[PDB]
From Swiss-Prot:
The chain holds residues 90 to 419 of 419 of the full protein. The active site is at D35, S199. This is Endothiapepsin. Keywords: Aspartyl protease, Disulfide bond, Hydrolase, Protease, Signal, Zymogen. Belongs to the peptidase A1 family. It catalyses: Hydrolysis of proteins with specificity similar to that of pepsin A, prefers hydrophobic residues at P1 and P1', but does not cleave 14-Ala-|-Leu-15 in the B chain of insulin or Z-Glu-Tyr. Clots milk. It comes from Cryphonectria parasitica. Residues 17-328 form the Peptidase A1 domain.
Amino acid sequence: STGSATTTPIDSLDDAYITPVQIGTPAQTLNLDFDTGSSDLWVFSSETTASEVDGQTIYTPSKSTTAKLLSGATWSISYGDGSSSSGDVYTDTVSVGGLTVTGQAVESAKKVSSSFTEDSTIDGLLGLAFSTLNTVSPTQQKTFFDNAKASLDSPVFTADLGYHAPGTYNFGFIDTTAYTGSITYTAVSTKQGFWEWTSTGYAVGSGTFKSTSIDGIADTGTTLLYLPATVVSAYWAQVSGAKSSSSVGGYVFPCSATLPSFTFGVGSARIVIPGDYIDFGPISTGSSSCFGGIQSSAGIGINIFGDVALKAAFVVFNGATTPTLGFASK
């Protein structure tokens, strides 16, 4: 089997991407944030505290003839931005882009933190990291991809995120028309449960490539590119007036600037992030200070190849017995 679904930016900055997902019988379609940095499929629901729902579409398990309470199971997750959610668990039929999994754990939120409530465009998350990170207790549950894997034509999914435009998540096949040149594959460590890999270096604009190993994760659920402070300083030093602002929470730059590109290495290959992808717009409405799309990872504990980096590439998440990642230009 295969599946193919379009993923759409939630706003004009590509702060996140939503993909329609069919849950239950008859189908209830929710727009979920596909997140290769986590491993829970959770949704706003009829069980979510009413004061914490503000415009999201909810899953109502009582209206699904295929929903079954997973008795005793609870979940609770905290994300790297400080947001969180928790609740109980049903199993139900879940379809993405024509690919159907029966018995998928659908984690129904009883509580969500304010940032979820405040984002009316995201109805939940669909985790695509390794199932060892799934938070369901006492019986850990499998991701959608893990459940689908054996049925897929090939044990892979691909992320093709757009810049200020829709893109595609494919399951079970590699669309050879969606990228240019060849796909360069690189080793993955699953030891932390992430799609963790080692970039071979970077360049700023037209500058020379610096060969240096940068361990990090391919994370569709993180907006920006978070890299070591040395690398980030070298980038922003090329932008007149750019500075790190403690009050804003990262590097800012004059909105009048033209940003240089940023290149990262994948083995001997190179992925170029155009400068425009690094512009996240005014820090507040009407400001002439703009927020940078490349930020330091120094406070995180891990480097994160988020959407800023991934949307410059066609990315293969290869879930073969030994997982690997593939990157192609496009």
